[PDB]
Design a protein around this ligand. Structure first.
Ligand SMILES: NC(=[NH2+])NCCC[C@H](N)C(=O)O
Ligand SMILES: O=S([O-])[O-]
Ligand SMILES: O=S([O-])[O-]
Ligand SMILES: O=S([O-])[O-]
Ligand SMILES: O=S([O-])[O-]
Ligand SMILES: O=S([O-])[O-]
Ligand SMILES: [Zn+2]
Ligand SMILES: [Zn+2]
Ligand SMILES: [Zn+2]
Ligand SMILES: [Zn+2]
Length: 270
């Protein structure tokens, strides 16, 4: 393609690495970019967050259409390339770990998300105010995000995504769309916040989903015991917990929330 060539050319121009680390794969199909941007309805008033600008192929399309783009990049060498190779008036590049740095105020996210940060980035995204996020993930991860309570891949991510978002896989994306060619497919994922969020206590969810195949009482007995509290002191309170006849992997957010309120009331949470 025309975009694979431009990549090869910039990599060699700056003498930099095909792969800087292992989850480094650049998107090289203009039509997958155009499809993400049109799925996000990027317009002249939107303020976009992008993570992992890479060589700026997506960033360039975003800057054409949006009013402001913030793009977070860990590697200072990539940043110096983006500054030299593009002329944008409306892009603010942020040096940092996208998981660790404080985020600017934005209404939309449009980004390929490196697989290494897919889980933490998604958890952080779901806790922020935004209209719309269109993001590319590995397919397996994307399928975890839309997994249904009681399915074999339902996990803390699945729960928090259901609790806090509407999540739609827009399309599969082939391995042929990145260089280097990955060994698994990706997916274009749309996220909108729920109008009716189910805000769950993070510590509780973590406690429960540590070992998600466990029944709900066993999960809570083991995790609070390990926090450092006696078994004898909580046995009976925890035996009467709502939804006790489920394994953690089967809980709807609504059922987690009841457990939260039951435990708040019994002094286990404040
Ligand atoms: N394939 C898609 N574009 N799906 C769009 C879903 C729209 C979204 N649920 C909304 O309320 O705006
Ligand atoms: O992360 S890539 O190497 O599949
Ligand atoms: O339009 S971009 O290539 O600066
Ligand atoms: O869509 S997968 O077959 O590359
Ligand atoms: O034994 S104490 O934690 O009530
Ligand atoms: O099912 S819970 O909301 O009582
Ligand atoms: Zn990077
Ligand atoms: Zn797996
Ligand atoms: Zn386990
Ligand atoms: Zn139940």
């Amino acid at each position: 393609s025309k975009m694979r060539d431009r990549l090869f050319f910039l990599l060699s121009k700056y003498g930099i690495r095909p792969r800087d680390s292992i989850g480094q794969h650049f998107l090289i199909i203009e039509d997958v970019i155009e499809k993400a941007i049109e799925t996000a309805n990027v317009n002249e008033n939107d303020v976009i967050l992008e993570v992992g600008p890479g060589l700026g192929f997506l960033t360039d399309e975003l800057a054409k259409r949006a009013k402001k783009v913030y793009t977070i990049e860990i590697d200072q060498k990539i940043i110096e390339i983006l500054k030299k190779e593009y002329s944008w008036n409306n892009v603010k590049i942020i040096q940092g770990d996208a998981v660790r740095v404080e985020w600017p105020k934005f209404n939309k996210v449009v980004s390929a998300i490196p697989y290494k940060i897919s889980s933490p980035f998604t958890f952080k995204l779901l806790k922020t105010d935004f209209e719309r996020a269109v993001v590319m993930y590995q397919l397996e991860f994307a399928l975890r995000m839309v997994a249904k309570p009681g399915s074999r891949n339902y996990s803390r991510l699945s729960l928090m995504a259901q609790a806090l978002g509407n999540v739609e896989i827009v399309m599969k994306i082939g391995k042929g769309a990145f260089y280097p060619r990955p060994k698994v497919d990706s997916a274009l994922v749309l996220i909108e916040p729920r109008k009716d969020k189910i805000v769950l206590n993070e510590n509780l969810v973590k406690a429960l989903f540590q070992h998600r195949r466990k029944t709900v009482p066993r999960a809570l007995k083991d995790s609070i015991h390990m926090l450092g509290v006696s078994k004898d002191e909580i046995r009976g309170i925890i035996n009467n917990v709502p939804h006790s006849n489920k394994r953690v992997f089967q809980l709807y957010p609504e059922e987690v929330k009841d457990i939260e309120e039951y435990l708040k009331k019994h002094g286990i949470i404040s």
